[PDB]
Design a protein around this ligand. Structure first.
Ligand SMILES: [Mg+2]
Ligand SMILES: [Mg+2]
Ligand SMILES: [Mg+2]
Ligand SMILES: [Mg+2]
Ligand SMILES: [Mg+2]
Ligand SMILES: [Mg+2]
Ligand SMILES: [Mg+2]
Ligand SMILES: [Mg+2]
Ligand SMILES: [Mg+2]
Ligand SMILES: [Mg+2]
Ligand SMILES: [Mg+2]
Ligand SMILES: [Mg+2]
Ligand SMILES: [Zn+2]
Lengths: 81, 129, 215, 125, 222, 55, 25, 97
RNA sequence: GAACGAAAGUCGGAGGUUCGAAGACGAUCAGAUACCGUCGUAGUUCCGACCAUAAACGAUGCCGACCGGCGAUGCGGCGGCGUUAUUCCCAUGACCCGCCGGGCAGCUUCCGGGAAACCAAAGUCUUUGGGUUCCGGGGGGAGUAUGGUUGCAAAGCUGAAAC
């Protein structure tokens, strides 16, 4: 949120979930930020470069996160063909 | 039995948003519903939608975003004059900056913001935010 | 990818352990993991989407920075043997058996940790860490069957948790991929010992009987 | 009537947790060791604690005890396992399981070496 | 003049001076356990009021036993308030327990505008609601300089929350503070949970402080 | 361990009985408390020994 | 007193007052 | 409030169930509500079967079994010690061993 | 406005097994006309009419959509060199596996509601609007009195006020 002067007004911009596009609340302890790292070439060396998949509380409680991580990384191309 | 098909659409939209699904199956098709979803696309709350054209009556599949908090249909479709929209502003929209109201005007399906510039007014289908 | 593909020795190990067979009850989120039913109630779990979730679980475990931030839990005795020589091998911290609820919630007890990733064996036998995950904000990897709940679960690996050979093969090949990602073992190099440590040992009746027969 | 109190058992567990090398299988030695490593006012309490300490020593020296595990017991748990025979890690190169996984090995590209012919009726459950 | 007795690894990051603000903790929704962390982050958030100390009873074999249930509303005026409920056998013990639990259950408050983007926000971003028991509390945005039109207890709560201007609408047993104040707390806690049309873009996904300063935590844990 | 006093208070309603009992703290050195330890309180020592093994 | 027998005794009083009206029409 | 989801009996589809008389106190109770069991006894008590087996004409070629439909009602069945009370979580149970 | 409407009750015709309002006794009880027992009228049965009431209950209006899973049952349809029955291809029979349509249902669940019990409806309700019918505004007085109306009657429907 900005004003007419063009300043950054909001205190903190919360994490929008990568599954349901919902804002994770401050007291929402049932959320998680999954971390999966990138893979190198034919040698198969581990990278410090990683990617973050945010999963929120209702998705984690309903169990949609299991299919959600694979259907989110399928657009990346890192989980499957 | 079967009436207010825009409300029949938005109930499925509302339950899919509250469940957290990706896309919706909506069995009626009205040009009211098509222009309603066109306004929602133009304001960007929903995504791409495909109307499977059945021979009798098709089925609309809307790729959801996750943005829609609440959308519904005001039932009897009140006939609304200008200088009376502020009642619906204070009754429907959660704030001044946010939300939109769908005014069926005399020149087509329009918006609450579009109606004060077109200076037409008319009926109200519902609201979406 | 192109190097993370399964090989003929890998499918020999999987078909020798017999992890392709699963439970008799279905789940509504295990539908894309199963391929085809079979007579006498047994349902066949595939290998490709199992290997992909094993690969992503290995990626997530090597993605940690502190080895103390990964905790390994199993309550059943088929996994209690595997946990102690799994977590003390490469990169985790073990706990087995009676979980003592309050391990991660309250701080009056010295058995209190702050993990950043969790790998458990059976959800039905370890429902209590699945419950206590929400108060700690940790992800969860689980070796799920076709008849296991998927609440507070992020990565699910479809398998048979009843077969001790299957459990030991999964923990062994998981650590075998984790070590090759970390760089301890090269890609074209076999492991030094045959994984029975992670499988099982029947106690000293037939153990000492087979020892006296092998004298 | 040896159903001694939780304070007695907990004191003996603190003794076996802190000091393990000082303790043996002899009651007459362990009673004297406990009076150097702890302060017990009552002589009957000395005898009770030392008797349960000898019982814990006879349990620990014979087998594994869940109630406490020192670093030496962790090294013993490491020692108990590593003797691994080579009998049933992998079988001979003939394995027959299922026509469904035969179709899986036909679809997904792998060996599909041996033959598979097993037919069962529908008398499941 | 007492040692903090380092524990729970978040306070150990605070004492290693690595998380600069409590905003970074609310970005990641990390759980808090001890109460002095936000006293370290906030030196003027001690403005509090006990709302009601009501007695509750338990009918024992001969005489009824009493224990006092203390409600304490804490808050700094920048938009960070907390509510604490504690039942205890002693008055000051229940008051201290409710203060500590309010320090634990502090939340931030989102502040919005009425429709002009001048600066220094004063109101809720939209019409929000909160339910506890049967108590439905509705918070409506207000123009500049309107004030807080409510009961004195949530008037004091929203005065501590930095909301200078708001409209309220309560339905249910408003007479019970243990539901009415918690419904107001849920209504002011849903303010960040409301989906807003100015957070369309995918977030930056900044690194966790555990990943950023793992090594200090390792050398203080080992 | 316990100092116990039973006294009377004469008011206009009649007599009022007061019973004050105080458990004394353990003070092994001094005239403030008892020198004898409690029979239930089992006092163990800390781990004493340290480094320098063979050579 | 049951509501059933309250209703039946008021019913008996109603019958008595009806017979009183028939006695003095 | 409700104590049971079934409201005592098992009438869910229909609207009327025929009353069948009880055994102890002889009260007409609908059959889905009354305690309906089937007792299977030997015709002679087992301490007296051996006397008839010793003093029988045939060489153990007859063994009759007595089958009785037993039909109690729940007002006297608790006194008759069949349908003892249980807990709230214990009312969800099934056929006892 | 109208058709059915349990049981009991009323008016005719046939009998009368059992039970059995009232009634009569025999017992307990300080007191019993009641709970226990014996006899027994009306009734309980059928055929003609009236009465239109219940804890007539799922204490939950009807129609239509959406929002989890699982094991089952019953009724139709479909598939299964699966199994067993005739004499033998030809067709229905029975078991077993899965799916589809509406139904009586059960277990779990943070999908949500609600004060909770509990509920896949009692949800899609302050983020409040699918259509429509009937009723509630503290407890009593009272479903009472007075009117109108139906009924042979008992009574039924509508149904206030003072305090
Ligand atoms: Mg006195
Ligand atoms: Mg009665
Ligand atoms: Mg009751
Ligand atoms: Mg009925
Ligand atoms: Mg009748
Ligand atoms: Mg007559
Ligand atoms: Mg008789
Ligand atoms: Mg009488
Ligand atoms: Mg008569
Ligand atoms: Mg009625
Ligand atoms: Mg009706
Ligand atoms: Mg059928
Ligand atoms: Zn009976």
């Amino acid at each position: 949120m900005q004003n007419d002067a063009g300043e950054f007004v909001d205190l903190y911009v919360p994490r929008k979930c990568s599954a349901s596009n919902r804002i994770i609340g401050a007291k929402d302890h049932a959320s998680i930020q999954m971390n999966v790292a990138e893979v190198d070439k034919v040698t198969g060396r581990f990278n410090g470069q990683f990617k973050t998949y945010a999963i929120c509380g209702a998705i984690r409680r309903m169990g949609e996160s299991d299919d959600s991580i694979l259907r989110l990384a399928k657009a990346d191309g890192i989980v499957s063909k | 039995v079967r009436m207010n098909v825009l409300a029949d659409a938005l109930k499925s939209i509302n339950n899919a948003e509250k469940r957290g699904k990706r896309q919706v199956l909506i069995r009626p098709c009205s040009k009211v519903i098509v222009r309603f979803l066109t306004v929602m696309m133009k304001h960007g709350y929903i995504g791409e939608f495909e109307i499977i054209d059945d021979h009798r009556a098709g089925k609309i599949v809307v790729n959801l975003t996750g943005r829609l908090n609440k959308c519904g249909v005001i039932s009897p479709r009140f006939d609304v004059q200008l200088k009376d929209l502020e009642k619906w502003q204070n009754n429907l929209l959660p704030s001044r900056q946010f939300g939109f109201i769908v005014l069926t005007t005399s020149a087509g399906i329009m918006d609450h913001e579009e109606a004060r510039r077109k200076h037409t007014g008319g009926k109200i289908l519902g609201f979406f935010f | 990818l192109d190097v993370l593909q399964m090989k003929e020795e890998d499918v020999l190990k999987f078909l020798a352990a017999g992890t392709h067979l699963g439970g008799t009850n279905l789940d509504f989120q295990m539908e894309q993991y199963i391929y085809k039913r079979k007579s006498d109630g047994i349902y066949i779990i595939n290998l490709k989407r199992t290997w992909e979730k094993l690969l992503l679980a290995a990626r997530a475990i090597v993605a940690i920075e502190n080895p103390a931030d990964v905790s390994v839990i199993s309550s059943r005795n088929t996994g209690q043997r595997a946990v102690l020589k799994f977590a003390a091998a490469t990169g985790a911290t073990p706990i087995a058996g009676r979980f003592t609820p309050g391990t991660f919630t309250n701080q009056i007890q010295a058995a209190f940790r702050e993990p950043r990733l969790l790998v458990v064996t059976d959800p039905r036998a370890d429902h209590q860490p699945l419950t206590e995950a929400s108060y700690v904000n940790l992800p969860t990897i689980a070796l799920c069957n076709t008849d296991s709940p998927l609440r507070y679960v992020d990565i699910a690996i479809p398998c048979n948790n009843k077969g001790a050979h299957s459990v030991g093969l999964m923990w062994w090949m998981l650590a075998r991929e984790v070590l090759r990602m970390r760089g301890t073992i090269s890609r074209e190099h076999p492991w030094e010992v045959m994984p029975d440590l992670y499988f099982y040992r029947d106690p000293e009746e037939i153990e000492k009987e087979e020892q006296a027969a092998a004298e | 009537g040896r159903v001694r109190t939780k304070t007695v058992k907990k004191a003996a567990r603190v003794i076996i947790e802190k000091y393990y090398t000082r303790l043996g299988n002899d009651f007459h030695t362990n009673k004297r060791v406990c009076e150097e490593i702890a302060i017990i006012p009552s002589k009957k309490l000395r005898n009770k604690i030392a008797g349960y300490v000898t019982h814990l020593m006879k349990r620990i020296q014979r087998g594994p005890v869940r109630g406490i595990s020192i670093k030496l017991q962790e090294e013993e748990r490491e020692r108990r396992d590593n003797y691994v025979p080579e009998v049933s890690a992998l079988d001979q190169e003939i394995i027959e399981v299922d026509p469904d996984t035969k179709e899986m090995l036909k679809l997904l590209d792998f060996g599909s070496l041996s033959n598979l012919q097993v037919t069962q009726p529908t008398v499941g459950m | 003049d007492k040692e903090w007795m380092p524990v729970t690894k978040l306070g150990r990051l605070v004492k290693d001076m690595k998380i600069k603000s409590l905003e970074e903790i609310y970005l990641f929704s990390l759980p808090i356990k001890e109460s002095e962390i936000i006293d370290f982050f906030l030196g003027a958030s001690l403005k509090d009021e006990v709302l009601k100390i009501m007695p509750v009873q338990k009918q024992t074999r001969a005489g009824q036993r009493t224990r006092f249930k203390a409600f304490v509303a804490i808050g700094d005026y920048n938009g960070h308030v907390g509510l604490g409920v504690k039942c205890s056998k002693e008055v000051a013990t229940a008051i201290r327990g409710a203060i500590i639990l309010a320090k634990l259950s502090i939340v931030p408050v989102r502040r919005g505008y009425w429709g002009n983007k001048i600066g220094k926000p004063h109101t809720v971003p939209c019409k929000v609601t909160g339910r506890c028991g049967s108590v439905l509390v509705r918070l409506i945005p207000a123009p500049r300089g309107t004030g807080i039109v409510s009961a004195p207890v949530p008037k004091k709560l929203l005065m501590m929350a930095g909301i200078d201007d708001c409209y309220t609408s309560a339905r249910g047993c408003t007479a019970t503070l243990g539901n009415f104040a918690k419904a107001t707390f849920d209504a002011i806690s849903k303010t960040y949970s409301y989906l807003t049309p100015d957070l369309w873009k995918e977030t930056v996904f900044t690194k966790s402080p555990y990943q950023e300063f793992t090594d200090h935590l390792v050398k203080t844990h080992t | 361990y316990v100092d116990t006093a039973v006294r009377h208070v004469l008011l206009r309603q009649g007599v009022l009985g007061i019973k004050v009992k105080i458990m004394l703290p353990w003070d092994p050195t001094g005239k403030i408390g008892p020198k004898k330890p409690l029979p239930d309180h089992v006092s163990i020592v800390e781990p004493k020994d340290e480094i320098l093994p063979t050579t | 007193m049951r509501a059933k027998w309250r209703k039946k005794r008021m019913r008996r009083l109603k019958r008595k007052r009806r017979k009183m009206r028939q006695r003095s029409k | 409030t409700k104590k049971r989801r079934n409201n005592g009996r098992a009438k869910k589809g229909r609207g009327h169930v025929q009353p069948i008389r009880c055994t102890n106190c002889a009260r007409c109770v609908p059959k889905d509500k009354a305690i309906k069991k089937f007792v299977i006894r030997n015709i002679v008590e087992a301490a007296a079967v051996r006397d008839i087996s010793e003093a029988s004409v045939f060489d153990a070629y007859v063994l009759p079994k007595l089958y009785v439909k037993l039909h109690y009602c729940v007002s006297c069945a608790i006194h008759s010690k069949v349908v003892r009370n249980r807990s709230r979580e214990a009312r969800k149970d099934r056929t006892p061993p």
